[PDB]
């Protein structure tokens, strides 16, 4: 074939604008509502655990193939990123998580990447700084429909530039999307969960109106005719009605005409506890958790046995699975081929598929095969050849590694 | 080095599954080996699809697109594309090119769940601050300061209930009566909630609306929501397996008959100690030979099919067909 | 590449100032709240039982490599943390969980790093005071968006001095923040309970 | 709480690892070029009961042979990382740079 003569075409219709039908919602001003989602208890406690969850995943740089080139330039890469926590490269793996969240909360977030020239001819990752999305006005685009360029304009930190409309092409940047249609269109993960957010402000309010009335009784007080505002009797009749506010303890002491009342609203206050739970539970199932990790398990029963998976593991997963898509597209091949030109296969990113098993089964195991290698002389070696002759799954069950990742870490 | 075609190919599944019918091109560059590598695969969201044309003899024909070109830079309209060029999704398809969506029977439910929460919007205000009234005589007209004065007592009473009520002798402040309490709504949104995910096909374990019912005993065979996405994945392995890899083969191998089939593994979650006891039975057995690890390994892979995959070591095919 | 030419920009909107948005909470008066919210009974325990299992975490010095001079220099940065309990100066690294305390509450905390000459020719860490941010009023920074440096304005104890727009700049210090946006702004951790405890 | 509490000791560390250590390092050796790190245990509930039997079961594998303790610290050692973490014993490493 010639090529791709058809362009990536937009999700718009005649109300359907860009994957979002809310006028409230449609540009910027669902920044401002996805940024107020986060004085939430049970928002920022669900991106709390979702984003401590994705930062301890265990990551490996996994190569090509069997072959040193590929082990070096995995290598090579794994000491960019420092999947190990720390390096004289300033923590560049965080700031990846922190764009990460910042496209989980807005939809697209981006950065910098900034490659000096290593000491060894190598080009060295340098920094990456983050691209907020509230500095972001639009980004530009290819005829073909694909994406072109990123149009900034923020402000300088200190008051120093405001910087206008700022263009930075995408092959010196990363850019991070939640729930992409294939289309360069980051619809945020904090869609479902604004109008249960809405209705609990507002129902928030309803009962501190309520409480007001229910509580402390509004008064009423009838006066005849002859007192009219601004009298002595008018102010009498204010004591009164702001003593039985605050002071209820001085009593009402009133004429043979005066009729002190409270307004008789007749019926008791309707329990609203069971509809705060109800838009609780809807945030909290919008943002994809199960009640019991996030504290909203509340007279509901508990899971029998589950599932293959859970919710919310399979919700981290997910997400975990989206990032290193993203690094492994956009960050990697920017890294390997400016350093290695030759370069066919890249390293991938992937973290380890972990399972919470009993160590005493890998403890009755151990001990049957240490009854097998009791008979022979020398114990470690051929010990050694019992481990690693074993399946790969319960070599990764004994929690001893294989010679390809320590191999790419410590060298 | 492609740029992830296959995750392309999930985002089109998904559309499918949300709208009933959606697509996607195939992108054919030529490889440096002389073989058409597949370059690149673009979606096709189905607001952007208006009609698909049909052969004389009901089948499809080809593909008729009207859509907007990101950046606003072309509006392209009517741009006819063959099939033999592209890939189609379909949900539940009745061997008739017709892809019904899989959102179809939670449309009603969802749309009494809205017209719910705005009647207990509505009722809220009534049954808790409680709707004011007030009577005075006739002698009060509109626009006068009395007319203000009875305006501000019921501002006050419903913005600032602690000014309390102060009335001539005349005035009658009230609150209307509804005379009855108001009816417990959670019922009708938890049951229009269960009919959303009932009608999705979903348990109500994993979403968390159990909710007072009781716990799964034993179950089936299978559950439901675990028939359900294998039922997905044997959907999109059969759209695959239909469309794509013909497209790839033959034009790579004209003399090809046998496809290749896309097959995912039949996962089961049995018990590591199981296999644990198991794995202890077999090093007892290797234990009095001398030479440990080939022996283990004949031992292995002379075990029938079902325990080889329990244990989890994979056969050479897998092996052959990955690294190579 | 040449470097980095995209500036560190704020946070800032029309409403949103610097990941802030309620005028209660803007400046230094959401820090009032946020040392008010110490009073609570169910947010003093929840800091109590965090602080106080982060505090026993069995933290370790891991080295570079097995190479004796990066084992020399991880017992060398061991002792001069002193990793075990105590030692001969003075318990440093009870003072950076001070300063993370305060910056998990206040967002930004920060603490000085007093380095005399040892005895051996190496230098010792001597000492670590902290930095309260009530103290400070304000950060600088750098032409390219990053901080610069540090401006303190407090009060000495005893009535002594009153310090004013004291400069600090950043490599004699260590700066902490919580759940930064890689921007170098600290929201503080207690901005999701306040709602709920003036209620 | 668990997660919690695993994230805030990263941050923790993380900020100590960027802004401390390089401080102390370049000062008094201006030729490095990896910093040495700081980083928790990972800690785990398990039972010791489980990790009695399995010595039960190790003492059993050395109680043929004359010398018992080096050949059992051989067999120690000879351990997978996890099951040696999981008895208590530690490395050479951390009391190589802890105690000198």
């Given at each position: 074939?010639?090529?791709?003569?058809?362009?990536?075409?937009?999700?718009?219709?005649?109300?359907?604008?860009?994957?979002?039908?809310?006028?409230l919602?449609?540009?910027?001003?669902?920044?401002?509502?996805?940024?107020?989602?986060?004085?939430?208890?049970?928002?920022?406690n669900?991106?709390?655990?979702?984003?401590?969850?994705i930062?301890?995943?265990?990551?490996?740089?996994?190569?090509?193939?069997?072959?040193?080139?590929?082990?070096?330039?995995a290598?090579?890469?794994?000491?960019?990123?420092?999947?190990?926590?720390?390096?004289?490269?300033?923590?560049?793996?965080?700031?990846?998580?922190?764009?990460?969240?910042?496209?989980?909360?807005?939809?697209?977030?981006?950065?910098?990447?900034?490659?000096?020239?290593?000491?060894?001819?190598?080009?060295?990752?340098?920094?990456?700084?983050?691209?907020?999305?509230?500095?972001?006005?639009?980004?530009?685009?290819?005829?073909?429909?694909?994406?072109?360029?990123?149009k900034?304009?923020?402000?300088?930190?200190?008051?120093?530039?405001?910087?206008?409309?700022?263009?930075?092409?995408?092959?010196?940047?990363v850019?991070?999307?939640?729930?992409?249609?294939?289309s360069?269109?980051?619809?945020?993960?904090?869609?479902?969960?604004?109008?249960?957010?809405?209705?609990?402000?507002?129902?928030i309010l309803?009962?501190?109106?309520?409480?007001?009335?229910?509580?402390?009784?509004?008064?009423?007080?009838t006066?005849?005719?002859?007192?009219?505002?601004?009298?002595?009797?008018?102010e009498?009749?204010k004591?009164?009605?702001?003593?039985?506010?605050?002071?209820?303890?001085?009593?009402?002491?009133?004429?043979?005409?005066?009729?002190?009342?409270?307004?008789?609203?007749?019926?008791a206050?309707?329990?609203?506890?069971?509809?705060?739970?109800?838009?609780?539970?809807?945030?909290?199932?919008?943002?994809?958790?199960?009640?019991?990790?996030?504290?909203l398990?509340?007279?509901?029963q508990?899971?029998?046995?589950?599932?293959?998976?859970?919710?919310?593991?399979?919700?981290?997963?997910?997400?975990?699975?989206?990032?290193?898509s993203?690094?492994?597209?956009?960050?990697?091949?920017?890294?390997?081929?400016?350093?290695?030109?030759?370069?066919?296969?890249?390293?991938?990113?992937?973290?380890?598929?972990?399972?919470?098993?009993?160590?005493?089964?890998?403890?009755?195991?151990?001990?049957?095969?240490?009854?097998?290698?009791?008979?022979?002389?020398?114990?470690?070696?051929?010990?050694?050849?019992?481990?690693?002759?074993?399946?790969?799954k319960?070599?990764?069950?004994?929690?001893v590694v294989?010679?390809?990742?320590?191999?790419?870490?410590?060298?």
């Amino acid at each position: 074939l010639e090529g791709a003569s058809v362009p990536v075409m937009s999700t718009s219709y005649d109300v359907v604008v860009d994957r979002e039908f809310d006028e409230l919602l449609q540009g910027k001003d669902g920044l401002l509502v996805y940024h107020k989602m986060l004085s939430d208890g049970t928002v920022k406690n669900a991106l709390n655990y979702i984003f401590g969850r994705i930062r301890s995943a265990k990551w490996y740089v996994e190569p090509a193939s069997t072959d040193p080139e590929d082990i070096a330039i995995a290598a090579f890469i794994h000491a960019q990123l420092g999947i190990d926590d720390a390096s004289v490269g300033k923590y560049p793996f965080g700031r990846l998580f922190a764009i990460y969240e910042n496209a989980y909360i807005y939809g697209m977030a981006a950065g910098e990447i900034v490659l000096t020239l290593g000491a060894d001819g190598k080009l060295i990752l340098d920094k990456i700084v983050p691209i907020h999305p509230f500095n972001i006005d639009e980004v530009l685009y290819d005829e073909e429909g694909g994406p072109k360029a990123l149009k900034l304009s923020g402000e300088v930190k200190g008051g120093s530039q405001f910087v206008n409309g700022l263009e930075i092409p995408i092959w010196k940047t990363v850019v991070f999307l939640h729930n992409d249609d294939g289309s360069f269109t980051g619809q945020s993960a904090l869609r479902a969960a604004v109008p249960h957010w809405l209705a609990k402000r507002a129902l928030i309010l309803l009962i501190n109106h309520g409480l007001e009335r229910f509580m402390i009784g509004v008064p009423t007080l009838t006066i005849p005719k002859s007192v009219r505002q601004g009298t002595k009797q008018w102010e009498a009749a204010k004591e009164i009605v702001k003593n039985f506010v605050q002071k209820p303890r001085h009593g009402i002491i009133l004429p043979d005409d005066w009729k002190f009342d409270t307004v008789d609203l007749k019926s008791a206050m309707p329990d609203a506890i069971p509809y705060l739970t109800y838009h609780d539970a809807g945030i909290a199932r919008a943002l994809g958790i199960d009640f019991n990790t996030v504290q909203l398990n509340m007279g509901v029963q508990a899971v029998n046995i589950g599932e293959f998976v859970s919710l919310t593991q399979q919700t981290i997963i997910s997400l975990q699975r989206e990032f290193a898509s993203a690094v492994n597209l956009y960050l990697i091949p920017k890294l390997v081929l400016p350093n290695w030109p030759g370069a066919t296969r890249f390293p991938r990113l992937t973290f380890e598929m972990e399972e919470r098993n009993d160590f005493s089964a890998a403890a009755n195991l151990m001990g049957m095969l240490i009854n097998a290698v009791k008979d022979s002389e020398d114990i470690p070696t051929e010990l050694k050849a019992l481990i690693d002759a074993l399946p790969s799954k319960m070599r990764r069950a004994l929690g001893v590694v294989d010679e390809v990742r320590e191999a790419v870490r410590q060298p």
